[PDB]
Design a protein around this ligand. Structure first.
Ligand SMILES: Cc1cc2nc3c(=O)[nH]c(=O)nc-3n(C[C@H](O)[C@H](O)[C@H](O)COP(=O)(O)OP(=O)(O)OC[C@H]3O[C@@H](n4cnc5c(N)ncnc54)[C@H](O)[C@@H]3O)c2cc1C
Ligand SMILES: Cc1cc2nc3c(=O)[nH]c(=O)nc-3n(C[C@H](O)[C@H](O)[C@H](O)COP(=O)(O)OP(=O)(O)OC[C@H]3O[C@@H](n4cnc5c(N)ncnc54)[C@H](O)[C@@H]3O)c2cc1C
Ligand SMILES: N#Cc1cccc2c3c([nH]c12)CCCC3
Ligand SMILES: N#Cc1cccc2c3c([nH]c12)CCCC3
Lengths: 588, 588
């Protein structure tokens, strides 16, 4: 019970003190540790409804019953007088660096969650080190500390989204009385990349400073787990060496995948190259239909690019497919060409990349349709976006004993633990979890606090809100319509749906019936909202708030009784009434 | 009990039928009424957990116990065979127009809630009429059906907001690689008003069509309640006449207020004139500090106007005052001049409005500071925005017996009822209620359904979300910080707060620490979120979703455990930690 919790907190904490806020004698020892710059976690026993039980239970270790007690790395250090004896006699910081290992904590992977974990760990006294290498792309693209979001993901994509919507700011700017001529402005790619790279720069720097000011040894080195507590590192100078840690965290994320065909790796790029590209790609083939694939097709189009997407099977597999279809129909209606049910066979080269003039090469793409017909067409740039995958063999010697799944990802209990007890994994290599940057951040912080601070809080992986930043934005929460039938049966599912139109689009003369939204509720369980969907502007802002109501289990009636803000788009959700079952049309 | 509910539903319904979905004999009578185009409400007894009790209780009226039973205006009409006897013998529509009054329902006021009520009422068979007059402003400004939001409120203001933000689209458009020169574009006022007026036109028309297709007699006439069931109307031709109604609904909203000083009414305008102004106002005095006053100062500035606001007392009285201050400091830092603690004495005229050249007059404003000092300065346009007020004496003869409060508003029970039983009020003349367009809409629909359909649902007036559409937008939900102390005491209040910066502002080189947000929770009641506040872009979208969680009573831990969407602004709310109490700084 409580019994058993507290033996784990004492064992795993680097430095921990039990106390009471109403106590001079706890206060006087805190003061000694602030001054000697000794960092620690602290449990105020007068603040848990468990504190009496623990205060007596503590004695199993300390053979005493009173506050304060200080432990260092599982070992009882002493009460008040003995601590200040260790201090007055100049013996403190030598016992507080007593460790069977170099580091309390070694984090392989300096990305989203990996930095999140390290930062929170050193807060509570754990001697923490953090390791990052960026494997260069086939053409040599490489970036700075921070991981996939910062450098080749959510941050550079979304700014590049923003530059695309500004293409319709200027269109609309005319009808609202501004005296520009949209039809005579042009977008410049280099100037756009230059700023996006300037901001990424300042993120790279800010993380290095953050780590340095928390006492975290950053180690620009490729790291491998040979034994449970032995991590082996290799630097830029190719020097080898082993470091040791009590607890080891695996947070190395993923990297892009390539179709096995002639020409791919040679003459094609991916997401990692695109965001610091030194020239505008020009005519572009986007192979793939993931969110990454449509989003990148999206801003390329919006910045005057000539864009084509080659769709193997469906658009956005695993999302609601009505919204898929709607998402893509906006993009077709606004430029982006789709090659439907189609698949590459080989890339040949017609012109080499000209790295003096900032100009692309030129390509011949050869592929086929599923019905038989051929596919042949020329393109200046070919971007593959067909999936991401981890590469744990480079990182995790199969001999240590961590159970990978069939995909390549790690099997973890609901506290992120691997089949070796001193190792854990978070981020994209956790199996069957949401592969999202704030999800990683959520895991790495809550896990840190349980290893080095006695926290019990788990991460809730369910019902995590998402948004795709396509020309029209799509934001989502919960099950998609088709699944929620496949689980409770059509009869048990009612759906409320509606078109709409942002007030801003009225004067701009935009479309009457493209925006859409729907609630998928369960009849039998009090009409409980099972999933929520919206396509229109600012879907991220519109969605995120409803992620809370839903995590508390909201029903339709909660939506009905709550009052809207006007004029907004989001206020349509409070007044829905037309059901799919009814057959009444959802227009305006 | 149930007993008593059902005598009210039978009494007030114009035409109502009790039935069961599993019934051929109910079906066969519905078919007869669809064909004769007879409209009605319908209670399926096999769908309430009260249905057995009612089915027997019904007999108090019908002396029978079986389905279906049809009543018209409180009178039992017959079972199946007798209804189709009335029909085969060509006697139906004559009994279904049996009424002790011309209309079931007379709605004085053709605005937000007033139209909302009328529309929902005629759905369930009630012979409904709707009345609207627009009292011309002192200079003669007048508009079409729809009310204050449509014509001189939320719709024309917010589009005019939109034209203001597009002023910073074009600024930012440069840094994202677009080849315009922001510094050489100018805004044209006439072209902007022209479009906003085009959209309002199409709203005016759409309401007239809506009313006409629901069978609602629209009566462009000024209406007055002389007796409880007698309403007297006067048209454009000044013709008098009386109409009679069973139930009477008061929904005439409000109109603008004027300071009692020389020159005001003569040489000044208000909100009603501004939105169809035929010239750009130029140099403008904004007297007032309501939301209306800052919002209008806001877009005038953003469209290059030279703008000044004269603040009697505080900014935005009744909102959080930290957010007030922050709101205004953005506007000062972005142009808008504030004359602090200051008050007009008189307006004199230097030039008359020149209505050929589309040019304003010119004014001399004379006023004083509260400390003594004088105020004297010239201005091309003076906009008064010092409060709205109803004028019920024009509408409601004091002799009938409806209890007004001290302000001028009506006293209603929590079902919108006036001290006369057949009369009700909704919208801005309901006392002590939120004066918001979707609030009016919410009252007018739920009230309709209870008068003519047996509904029991009330409107929940508490915790209604708001947003001010100032240059920086401020959206709000719940108590403001100062109140939530004044009710539970400082010790019981914890506050979580944080700065932030939209990812979009990064490349645009906008400000590091202007955006702000905070959660005001109650320690003792499980840290329950009492109010929520945000200042940044898209506050309306950002807020509205959290209006639901809060209506279900969300606590901080609900925010902590829910996962964010990234990059958005809204995702800061899921990761708050710094408390005001702690004193840790909220920057970035
Ligand atoms: C184009 C794109 C856009 C995206 N947009 C969004 C979005 O808008 N929102 C969202 O929530 N998610 C988005 N994602 C997903 C998001 O990036 C991931 O959830 C996130 O990056 C996962 O973080 P992580 O901490 O698991 O690992 P990563 O961020 O991938 O970081 C792990 C780091 O460890 C390094 N590493 C690997 N092996 C070693 C080794 N042996 N030694 C040392 N270092 C090593 C890697 O190079 C990397 O820098 C996007 C992804 C892509 C590709
Ligand atoms: C500038 C401005 C901006 C606003 N912006 C917002 C916003 O963004 N969001 C929001 O929620 N609220 C906003 N409001 C408030 C919103 O307009 C009100 O809540 C709403 O208009 C109230 O509607 P109502 O149905 O009570 O009456 P009204 O909309 O005022 O309609 C009543 C109608 O009845 C007419 N009438 C009066 N007397 C008679 C009579 N004797 N005979 C016939 N007809 C008569 C009136 O002329 C009017 O047309 C704004 C208000 C203003 C002034
Ligand atoms: N299409 C599109 C699109 C997608 C998202 C946001 C916007 C905005 C405009 N167009 C948008 C024009 C001005 C208002 C903001
Ligand atoms: N200041 C300001 C302001 C207020 C509300 C929204 C916005 C946006 C910009 N400025 C904004 C620039 C482009 C992104 C959208």
């Amino acid at each position: 019970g409580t019994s058993q919790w507290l033996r784990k907190t004492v064992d795993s904490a680097a430095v921990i003190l039990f106390s009471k806020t109403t106590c001079p004698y706890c206060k006087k020892v805190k003061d000694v540790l602030a001054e000697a710059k000794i960092k620690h976690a602290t449990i105020e026993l007068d603040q848990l409804s468990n504190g009496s039980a623990i205060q007596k239970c503590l004695a199993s270790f300390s053979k005493i019953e009173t506050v304060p007690q200080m432990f260092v790395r599982g070992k009882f250090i002493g009460d008040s007088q003995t601590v200040l004896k260790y201090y007055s006699n100049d013996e403190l910081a030598g016992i507080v660096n007593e460790s069977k290992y170099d580091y309390d904590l070694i984090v392989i992977g300096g990305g989203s969650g990996g930095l999140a974990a390290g930062k929170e760990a050193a807060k509570y006294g754990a001697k923490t080190a953090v390791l990052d290498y960026v494997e260069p792309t086939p053409i040599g693209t490489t970036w700075g500390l921070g991981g996939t979001c910062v450098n080749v993901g959510c941050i550079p994509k979304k700014l590049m989204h923003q530059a695309g919507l500004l293409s319709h700011a200027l269109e609309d700017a005319e009808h609202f009385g501004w005296s520009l001529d949209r039809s005579k402005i042009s977008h410049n790619w280099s100037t756009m990349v230059e700023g996006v790279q300037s901001h990424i720069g300042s993120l790279n720097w800010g993380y290095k400073v953050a780590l340095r000011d928390n006492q975290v040894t950053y180690l620009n080195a490729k790291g491998r787990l040979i034994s449970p507590h032995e991590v082996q590192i290799t630097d830029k100078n190719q020097k080898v060496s082993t470091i040791t840690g009590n607890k080891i965290i695996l947070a190395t994320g993923e990297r892009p995948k390539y179709p096995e065909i002639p020409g791919a790796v040679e003459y094609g790029i991916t997401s990692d190259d695109l965001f610091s590209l030194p020239y505008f790609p020009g005519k572009t083939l986007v192979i793939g239909a993931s969110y990454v694939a449509l989003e990148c097709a999206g801003f390329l189009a919006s910045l005057g690019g000539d864009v084509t997407v080659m769709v193997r099977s469906i658009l956005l597999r695993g999302f609601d497919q009505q919204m898929a279809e709607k998402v893509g129909d906006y993009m077709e209606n606004h430029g982006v060409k789709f090659a439907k049910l189609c698949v590459p066979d080989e890339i040949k080269q017609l012109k080499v990349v000209d790295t003096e003039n900032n100009k692309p090469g030129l390509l011949l793409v050869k592929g086929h349709y599923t019905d038989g017909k051929k596919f042949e067409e020329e393109f200046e740039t070919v971007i593959f976006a067909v999936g991401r995958e981890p590469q744990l063999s480079k990182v995790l010697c199969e001999t240590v004993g961590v159970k990978l799944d069939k995909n390549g990802r790690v099997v973890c209990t609901d506290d992120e633990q691997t089949t070796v007890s001193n190792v854990y994994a978070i981020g994209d290599i956790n199996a069957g979890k949401p592969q999202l940057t704030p999800v990683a951040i959520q895991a790495g912080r809550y896990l840190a606090r349980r290893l080095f601070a006695g926290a019990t809080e788990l991460t809730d992986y369910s019902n995590v809100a998402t948004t795709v930043f396509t020309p029209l934005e799509y934001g989502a929460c919960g099950l998609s319509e088709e699944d929620a039938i496949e689980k409770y049966g059509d009869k048990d599912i009612e759906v409320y749906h509606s078109n709409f139109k942002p007030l801003e689009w009225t004067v701009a003369h935009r479309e009457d019936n493209v925006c859409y939204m729907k609630l998928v509720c369960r009849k039998s369980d009090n009409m409980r909202v099972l999933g929520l969907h919206v396509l229109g502007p600012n879907a991220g802002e519109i969605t995120q708030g409803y992620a809370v109501a839903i995590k508390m289990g909201a029903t339709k009636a909660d939506f009905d009784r709550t009052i809207g803000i006007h004029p907004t788009c989001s206020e349509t959700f409070t007044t829905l009434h037309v059901t799919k079952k009814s057959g009444v049309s959802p227009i305006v």
